[PDB]
Amino acid sequence: GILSSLWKKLKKIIAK
DSSP states (O other): OHHHHHHHHHHHHHOO
16 A cells, blocks of 8 residues: 555656
């Protein structure tokens, strides 16, 4: 669960 927020944070860098 909480890890998914961290994952979407690294995804945020990819997503411009």
